[PDB]
Design a binder for this molecule. Sequence first.
Ligand SMILES: [Mn+2]
Ligand SMILES: [Mn+2]
Length: 425
Amino acid sequence: GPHMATGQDRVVALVDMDCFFVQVEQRQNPHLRNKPCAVVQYKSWKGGGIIAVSYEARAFGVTRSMWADDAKKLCPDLLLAQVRESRGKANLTKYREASVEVMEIMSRFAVIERASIDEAYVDLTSAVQERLQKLQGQPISADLLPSTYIEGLPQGQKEGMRKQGLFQWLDSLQIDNLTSPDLQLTVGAVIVEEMRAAIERETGFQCSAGISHNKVLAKLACGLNKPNRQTLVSHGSVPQLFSQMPIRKIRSLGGKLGASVIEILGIEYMGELTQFTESQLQSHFGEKNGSWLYAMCRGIEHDPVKPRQLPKTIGCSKNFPGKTALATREQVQWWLLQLAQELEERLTKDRNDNDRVATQLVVSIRVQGDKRLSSLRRCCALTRYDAHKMSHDAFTVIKNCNTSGTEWSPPLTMLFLCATKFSAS
DNA sequence: ATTATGACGCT
Ligand SMILES: [Mn+2]
Ligand SMILES: [Mn+2]
């Protein structure tokens, strides 16, 4: 009872830009704003592959990983913006720079963990304590939370429901106890409203956010009310929320492990996990996953918000699917040089912006007909930022997968070059 | 033939 810690020590938010690549292109091209539109890579094969979809387009059924020509069959008015192409490949530079704008704003409020190009986690515990002291017992007004949903409320028109739920939550709030977890989440959400307002002011970009006591719940909350809304998931709301949450919806259970949880244990929803002892879960899924599942199904996760705004690796990848697979020495050399040239550009920019050099070069390839996504992965030294040297070294390091007797066999369906092992410069 | 990345765990 008194000693069963409930993992309410922290306030953690997950901020995620709504259809990020689409918004970047819509800021740049006003003709796309408030339209069904999507961002694509390439244009020859089936119109190109969609990697980002506006909410207007989603309402027609357009999804990521779908061909533009098929999307156009669901949504004939769909507008398309194309990723930049450089040295024969997709170049995501515009979005990395837009991402950095956003990250730098978020960093003004608290320490952030860049979790992907369009989303970051925030540790708000210190910010909330400071702010709670600043109120000096003053109660929290609904006006401070204009886009916040309280998950699980109301109990017992869309905006009408939102406001009822918020009213229930705020009426039930104990503003004098500077140590109540629910008060702390609430103040955290006020700060997140401010962060999202500053992001929109200063970039034009809208985002959603989740506010809870840990990373997994913050992330799950962020998705409950998209777009341009934020959702507070309290400790108390976990039992009902999880009672019908499919296991696959939780971060890291979306794949094979989640499928084996479902199959082995004979269950469907996160909440069912509570009925198993910790040892039972560790037995089925190993000691780490077992402890983690035993606490997660109760709303408790201890993974910290890492103070890391910048990517830990810088990578360059191109698939050569179908009949485009690389089959000669000349071909493999030229594409390794194109990849190495983009990598050199990004690395030099990184060294100047962020005072660090990479020291290790990772070369990965896929060969045709190989089941694996990485047919091979080998590392060598990365000593100077020179594309000719990096491409030569990647060759040097992969060339003994050629089984020919100036040809290349098995032909390569993927090249990948990744700079890693960063050291302060 | 949806692709381009990137974190992290296992061994
Ligand atoms: Mn997003
Ligand atoms: Mn998405």
